[model samples]
Target chain A: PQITLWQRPLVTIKIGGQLKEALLDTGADDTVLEEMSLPGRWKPKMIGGIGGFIKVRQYDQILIEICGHKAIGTVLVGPTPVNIIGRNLLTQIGCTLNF
Target chain B: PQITLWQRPLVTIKIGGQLKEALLDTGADDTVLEEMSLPGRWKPKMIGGIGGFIKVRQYDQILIEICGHKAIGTVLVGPTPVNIIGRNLLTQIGCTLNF
Candidate 1:
């Protein structure tokens, strides 16, 4: 019930019903997603890179509760449509993004 | 006062006062140094990946110019080792690094 974006800070999350959110790039050392954008259902743990380290199957595992933050992680799938938050979840939401 | 790379269409590239470089990548797709390898460096932003539309980033900005081509050999570390410059820097330089 707290919607405020475009002034300076922004927040509008409503997963499942879909409000759309995925933007956290901690300087990004390494950690990627985009086999298809992931989110159709959620299924992660198919490890390996894209070309030598391979893993592609079904995926499911969705749970989120973010105010300050609480965590449980793993995301890798095949058909998502959109979901990009790199640097392994942006260093678990710590710090690193001057620009 | 440039020294030029090992060869192969390479050219001189002095980044700092001491002059150094850094480049190497087996290519699983990961491993970067974006604050400027050193030598007053600062060049990183030419990402594409339509089906291969790379990515684009700019703000503080940096430098890295490898005209034509010339990464003749050796590259791993340095304050600014000026490596052979790898990952193709993404497509070595464009069109295939992310989307």
Candidate 2:
């Protein structure tokens, strides 16, 4: 069978002195934070992956507001081209992810 | 024992006509793209998480440049305050992550 997907509208956020329109992706299990998109200057703990398998280090937290819903949590940083909202973060909203 | 990490300088990126400062995070394994900051003109597929994991949707590829280095990759999105740098991406620079 093919995998089912849930895709929502693009949300807006302000990062690194700019505004962004984005979608809420809940598939990937971890929260991926880009270094260039959001405001830094936060200190946070390292959130471990499933079963504490991988220790993903987070430098700070972000107040997430999607479709007017909001939450604040630690965000992991990376060198990639963008910021991400993952499954590990999806649980916070208590919903599902899809295409 | 304490974990060892590699701390590096923040790099600058241009997205949506804005100059953004970014950090190179190696802890995150997958590429995350921010819908708001990136030029959301090109959409791409996403790689599943670790262990046949959840599939995070992706949109577009970008040419990443830092300290005379560059890579092309995809980015994920969602409700959050900032972008990140992670492990899956650390391999590009072949460096360690730290405080």
Candidate 3:
């Protein structure tokens, strides 16, 4: 898709009928939303990153749209400063690193 | 190169005569190393991410090699859990988002 990285790799995403701006984080393992509301039940999970570990609510079968491309996957809601679109959803869109 | 996003987008990189594993973080504006001792003076800087804002030592003219591709750019070193390859070096290598 030739998405450019100007400052932060920011992208527009729509999840659960809400529009949001998220960072395309290849470093993150799970897609973590800053804040959201989901229908189904979720389990508590912990994820570790450069900072440390963060507890998250893991919700599965989340429908998300990035750049008009739609996919269904698991989403984690937690105390993150920003919304992070991680590898879990990047794989679904067949995203890759190109030079 | 088409790097796969299995869990986290991890890649092996060589920097400052040492080889290390780093996350390909498009979300990050500057490439940050967990710890490194380089031969140049660095300016103190701060960067914000998913977790929080982190203080960093911004070293310039760092020679980094990722996936056999070499690039020279500014590299940040600080107290991080993992090494992050950010858009600063990614742009130097002509790396982009592809689907």
Candidate 4:
């Protein structure tokens, strides 16, 4: 699928048996999601962005279905305004930026 | 150009007669740059991201050369760790996400 940049590149993703909309954030180094409940142990981590840094829970080796494409990677849960699918998962799903 | 998600999509951009590296951020709604001096009047604005919201100066109809492609759009100047070329300028440069 080819997505134009005229709008926000939001897509549906399946994580932890729940469906949610997430943005494909090429600028982000790691995937960050809104605080949620997931099965498994996680570690405390902090990530920085446009504004500043925020603490999050990092869950490793999580399976996520992004736009029907399956990908397994580390996912961070935090108090983010929106769910972002960063380069970690994007690479696994074969996503790229084209011009 | 096709940029793989395996690495960060950083590109050289020419803005305000200076060269700088920036990330092509698909999830960002507006283009934001680090604090810089430009020859024009700007308005005070605020934008939010994964961390939080921050105040910035919005300069409209700014001309920027992104990876040698010319584009004119709104550019926000603030305290950002990295310069981000968002969807507003990405669309002008015919950038898209492909999988």
Candidate 5:
């Protein structure tokens, strides 16, 4: 799938048996999702970005279906304005940037 | 040019007569660069992300040559960890996402 940058690169993603929209964030190093509950245990972690830093729960080996492509990776649950699919999962789905 | 997600999608950009590297950030709504001086009038503004909000100087109609493609838009100067080329500039350069 090819997506233009004319609008926010928001895509439908399935995680933890629920559907959600996430942004393909190339600037973020790790995938960060809004606060949610998962089956496994998570450890408290901190992630920083353009604004500042925030503490989050890190869950590893989580399976997510991004635009129908299945990928398993580490997911960070925090209070983000939007769910972000970072390079960690983008690489798993063979996503790329083109001009 | 096609950039794989295996690594950070960092690209050389020319801004204010200086060359620097920036990430093609699809998740960001506006372009934000590390603290820099630009010859123009700017207003104080606030931008937020996964962590929280931060105050930045918003310079409008700034010219930036991203990967050799020239674009003019609003650029936020702040304490960002990395320079981010957001959708505003990405669309100008015909950048897209593919999988």
Candidate 6:
């Protein structure tokens, strides 16, 4: 299936049993969600990008549902401005950049 | 054609007769390049993201080539950490999220 790209390619995803809108970010390596509560403990880490670096909690084996497609991957919880579904789960859902 | 997404989907693009590696960013709305001196005048603007907001010089009608596909669109030049090829130019090449 083809995903749509709007001003921002945002889609609804089920994470931590909650539905949230996340940006489909091909540029990002891992999924980073706006600070959220998860069930298990996680490790602390830092990630850098265009702006700068920020600290995050790296949680593994998270169940993510995009457009009804489900996949288990790592989801980082942090003070991110937006929820980003990176290539990690995108690949599991068979997503690719097509023309 | 299908495009591959690595840890970060970086691709070679030709801008202003110079070849530069740019991140194929589905997260960004507008294409942003690192500080560069362009021929024409540009408008001053500000863009905000996960980290923070930064002032940028928006140049219009700039020619960009991605994977041999040519496009004329707006390019924002700023103190970006990396060059980003956003959907503004991606759509010109008929890019989409395919599964």
lDDT of 2 by residue, A1-99 (tens): 111211232356544445666433432445655554456564444443322233344645677654444556656665323455654444555433111
Per residue, candidate 3 scores C-alpha lDDT tens digits across A1-97 of 7787766778899998899998887877789998679879999998866566778899999999998889889999999888999899998888887
Candidate number of the best TM-score? 4
What's the TM for model 4? Answer: 0.98
Per-residue lDDT of model 6, residues B27-49, tens digit only:
88999999887778789999876
CA lDDT of A26 in candidate 1? 23
DockQ per model, Cα: 0.04, 0.02, 0.67, 0.89, 0.85, 0.71
i-RMSD values for every candidate model: 17.3, 17.6, 1.8, 0.8, 1.0, 1.6
For candidate 5, lDDT tens digit of each residue in B1-99?
988888888999999999999989998889999999997899999998766788899999999998889999999999888898899999999998999
Q: Give the alpha carbon lDDT tens digit for every residue of B1-99 in model 1.
A: 222112221233333323333332222132233343333333344432112222322322224443333322212222211233334332333312111
Reproduced native contacts, each prediction: 0.00, 0.00, 0.71, 0.91, 0.90, 0.71
> Judged by lDDT, which candidate is best?
4
Ranking by lDDT: 4, 5, 6, 3, 2, 1
Candidate 6 CAPRI-style tier = medium
- In terms of DockQ, the best-performing candidate is 4
The models' CA-based lDDT, in order, is 0.31, 0.43, 0.85, 0.92, 0.91, 0.86
lDDT of 4 at A56: 95
Compose the digit string of candidate 6's lDDT tens values, residues A1-99.
776565678889997789999998898888899978897889988887667778999999988899789999899989898999888888888888976
**What is the CAPRI rating of model 2's predicted complex?**
incorrect
lDDT value for model 4? 0.92
Isolated chain A TM-score, each model: 0.24, 0.51, 0.94, 0.97, 0.97, 0.93
lDDT of 2 by residue, B3-96 (tens): 1111222456544455656544333445454445555564444443322233334545655654444545655553222344333333443433
Better candidate by lDDT, 1 or 4:
4
For residues A36-94, write the lDDT of model 5, one tens digit per residue: 98778999898988667888899999999999999999999988888999999999999
Looking at model 2, residue B64 earns an lDDT score of 60
Tens digits of per-residue lDDT, candidate 3, B1-99, equal: 677776677789999789999888887778999877987799999887655677889989988998788999899999887889999888888888877
Any runs in candidate 4 off by more than 4 Å, and if so which? none
Candidate 4 reaches a DockQ of: 0.89
**Lowest-lDDT window of 10 residues in candidate 5 chain B?**
B46-55
lDDT of 3 at A99: 73
